[PDB]
Design an enzyme around this catalytic site. Structure first.
Site, PDB file in Angstrom:
ATOM      1  CG  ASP A 144     -48.671 -30.964  70.932  1.00 36.59           C
ATOM      2  OD1 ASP A 144     -47.611 -30.315  71.036  1.00 36.59           O
ATOM      3  OD2 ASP A 144     -49.091 -31.724  71.828  1.00 36.59           O
ATOM      4  CB  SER A 145     -51.108 -35.949  67.222  1.00 31.73           C
ATOM      5  OG  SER A 145     -51.323 -37.331  67.450  1.00 31.73           O
TER       6      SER A 145
END
Ligand SMILES: [Zn+2]
Ligand SMILES: [Zn+2]
Ligand SMILES: [Zn+2]
Lengths: 262, 114, 65, 56, 43, 49, 85
Positions: free
Chosen positions: F4-5
């Protein structure tokens, strides 16, 4: 002969052309140098002497930094880090002064034209704020109320967009090639029909549509790159591309010089 | 609080050479050239020019980490062909192509009234 | 506060046309899209940069200081 | 349970973590500031006397 | 050395002196910016 | 950008993207500990301190 | 009486990973403290590498006391221990 340029259209700050007989890597490197490696002049240092606006000194300094400045004679100007000077000498920097204040009931709008060049340019048309709006006011900077005095100095140095985006001479550099899927570089995502889902590109009219009868051409390579260069205003698009080519050639020459020296 | 020096990306550090050429023992007649303070812009173009030469056998550019402005180009040519000569020829060809493109663009711009 | 000097995505200068944008919206009573197109904003990055901006500078200036 | 089973530590740092495909499996990136703050007491030996002098 | 929040008029008061504005009864008594040179960069 | 970065444009970051201003206020008082004794707002001069 | 003779030892002759780590750490600590080195160094300065090389050459003069739960202990020299790693 080599690579040739076919300028489909040109404008004051927007030129769309076609490059032929050029490798994809060369075109990509040209785009990269044109977007990042072109030297440009922009406000670097901001000294505040009397500021009382609702905004902040850092905020207004950042806004001023993004203000385009004339950089036609940027090559004549030299980097401050190079020339032997104490600080922001006239030979490596451009000095401007911003002064303003409000009055009884009329807010004072600060524009790019308000900046006044104070250093000696020695007859060089460099550092002049860029004005393109029809009204001619320029880029809005801030608003001053009655009793709000703005008084500051701006020093602009030669630099490249890599160090900071404020030096970017081109806003958007559109680069396309192979409008019709001839090289199979992209697998169009489709749910019912690939052709229907994806509209034909504008450049598609400049290349013959593919014929299903013939097989896939495995020997074909990327060619006929359509490139549209738009200039923020500091440098015209033609000069933008010329300076990008010059910077790339200078970098290659520097690599050769280093190889020879070592 | 400890962001990298932005100017340091394209400026050579103190006591740092622009190019570092060393031999490669993986394959015969193979060399590694480390380019400092350079990005994909020059590496990809140089590698593409090198691959266009029949004599050049292997030419691969690698960027170790985005943080550091540096890359490494591995070049292997045929026996009796010095990789430095191949790199010099590729750079000369790139310069010639860039000059031709500049001349063509200038001529086209002059021809067009706008 | 003030309209951004340059577009975040591409970097095109959009601060010049904010006053023109307001004049077109008010004086000519044109819709948002038509006014933006007339100003010369093709890429939707600048379109959303201008359309989504809020003039908080005027609200801050409403105060006496 | 507050000072014997678990007690505060001097030589240690804490901060956020970010992904990095360009790092080895056993290699962990460390901020320069954290590296400067954190120290190791290396004893002076003839083998690395010059290196320790340079560090000093 | 000091200014009023409302009047915005200089006071230049000294030690062991009232901190209330002379023109009005308000006593916010803001202070003006330092005279020392200040520089900022767009970076 | 895994786990999810996200990857953010450096050019946009330095061009005015998600820049923030942080304001922190410190309050001080001359609270009196004993009548006739009070704190004083003065620059220390190292004497008797 | 608790000490068991050299022979008739029921412990595993093969070196344990914990034992290997302890021996490496002790040798590195001793070397860092200017202890004698029994193996010629070919341009090596890291104490851990020197300890690893000494273990490979079985030049480490340390000992291991395998302690049984009751209290009896068995002595094992580093040279006789077998390093599977
Ligand atoms: Zn200078
Ligand atoms: Zn935009
Ligand atoms: Zn007052």
């Amino acid at each position: 002969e080599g690579p040739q340029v076919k300028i489909r259209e040109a404008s004051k700050d927007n030129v769309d052309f076609i490059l032929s007989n050029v490798d994809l890597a060369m075109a990509n490197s040209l785009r990269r140098v044109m977007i990042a490696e072109i030297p440009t002049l922009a406000i670097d240092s901001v000294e505040v002497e009397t500021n009382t606006t609702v905004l902040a000194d850092e905020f207004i300094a950042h806004r001023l930094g993004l203000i385009p400045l004339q950089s036609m004679d940027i090559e004549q100007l030299e980097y401050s880090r190079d020339c032997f000077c104490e600080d922001h000498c006239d030979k490596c920097s451009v000095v401007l002064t911003l002064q303003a204040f409000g009055e009884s009931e009329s807010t004072t709008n600060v524009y790019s034209k308000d900046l006044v060049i104070v250093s000696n340019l020695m007859g060089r048309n460099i550092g002049h704020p860029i004005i393109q709006d029809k009204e001619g006011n320029g880029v809005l900077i801030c608003k001053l109320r009655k009793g709000q005095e703005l008084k500051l100095t701006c020093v602009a140095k030669k630099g490249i967009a890599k160090e900071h985006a404020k030096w970017g001479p081109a806003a958007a550099i559109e680069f396309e090639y192979d409008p019709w899927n001839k090289l199979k570089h992209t697998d169009y995502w489709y749910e019912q029909d690939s052709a229907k889902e994806w509209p034909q590109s504008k450049n598609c009219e400049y290349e013959d549509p593919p014929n299903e009868g013939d097989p896939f051409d495995y020997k074909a390579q990327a060619d006929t790159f359509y490139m549209n260069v738009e200039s923020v205003g500091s440098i015209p698009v033609d000069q933008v591309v010329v300076r990008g080519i010059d910077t790339l050639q200078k970098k290659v020459a520097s690599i050769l010089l280093a190889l020879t020296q070592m | 609080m400890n962001a990298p020096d932005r100017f340091e990306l394209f400026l050579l550090g103190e006591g740092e050479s622009k190019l570092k050429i060393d031999p490669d023992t993986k394959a015969p007649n193979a060399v590694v050239i480390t380019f400092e303070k350079e990005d994909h812009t020059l590496g990809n173009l140089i590698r593409a020019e090198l691959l266009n030469d029949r004599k050049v056998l292997f030419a691969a550019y690698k960027v170790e980490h985005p943080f550091f402005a540096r890359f490494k180009l591995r070049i292997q040519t045929t026996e009796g062909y010095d990789p430095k000569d191949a790199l010099k020829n590729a750079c000369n060809s790139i310069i010639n192509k860039l000059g031709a493109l500049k001349t063509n663009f200038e001529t086209e711009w002059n021809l067009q009234t706008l | 506060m003030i309209v951004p000097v340059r577009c975040f995505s591409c970097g095109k200068v959009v601060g010049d046309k904010w006053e023109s944008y307001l004049n077109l919206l008010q004086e000519d009573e044109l819709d948002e899209g038509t006014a933006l197109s007339r100003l010369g904003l093709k890429r939707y990055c600048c379109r959303r940069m201008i359309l989504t901006h809020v003039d908080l500078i005027e609200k801050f200036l409403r105060y006496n200081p | 349970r507050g000072n014997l089973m678990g007690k505060r530590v001097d030589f240690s740092a804490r901060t956020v973590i970010s992904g990095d495909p360009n790092l080895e499996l056993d290699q962990v990136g460390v901020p320069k500031s954290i590296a400067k703050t954190l120290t190791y007491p290396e004893v002076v030996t003839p083998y690395n006397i010059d290196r320790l002098t340079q560090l000093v | 050395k000091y200014i009023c929040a409302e009047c915005s008029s200089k006071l230049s008061l000294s030690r062991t002196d009232a901190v209330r504005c002379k023109d009005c009864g308000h006593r916010i008594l803001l202070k003006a910016r330092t005279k020392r040179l200040v520089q900022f960069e767009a970076r | 950008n895994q786990e999810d970065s996200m990857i953010m444009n450096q050019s946009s970051i330095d061009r005015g993207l998600f820049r923030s201003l942080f304001f922190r206020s410190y309050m001080d008082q001359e609270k009196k500990y004993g009548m006739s004794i009070t704190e004083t707002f003065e620059k220390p001069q190292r004497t008797n301190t | 009486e608790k000490a068991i003779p050299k022979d008739q030892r029921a412990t595993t002759p093969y070196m344990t990973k914990y034992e290997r780590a302890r021996i490496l750490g002790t040798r590195a600590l001793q070397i860092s403290m200017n202890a004698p080195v029994f193996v010629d160094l070919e341009g090596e300065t890291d104490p851990l590498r020197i300890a690893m090389k000494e273990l490979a050459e079985k030049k480490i003069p340390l000992v291991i006391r395998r302690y049984l739960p009751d209290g009896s202990f068995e002595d094992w020299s580093v040279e006789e221990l077998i390093v599977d790693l």
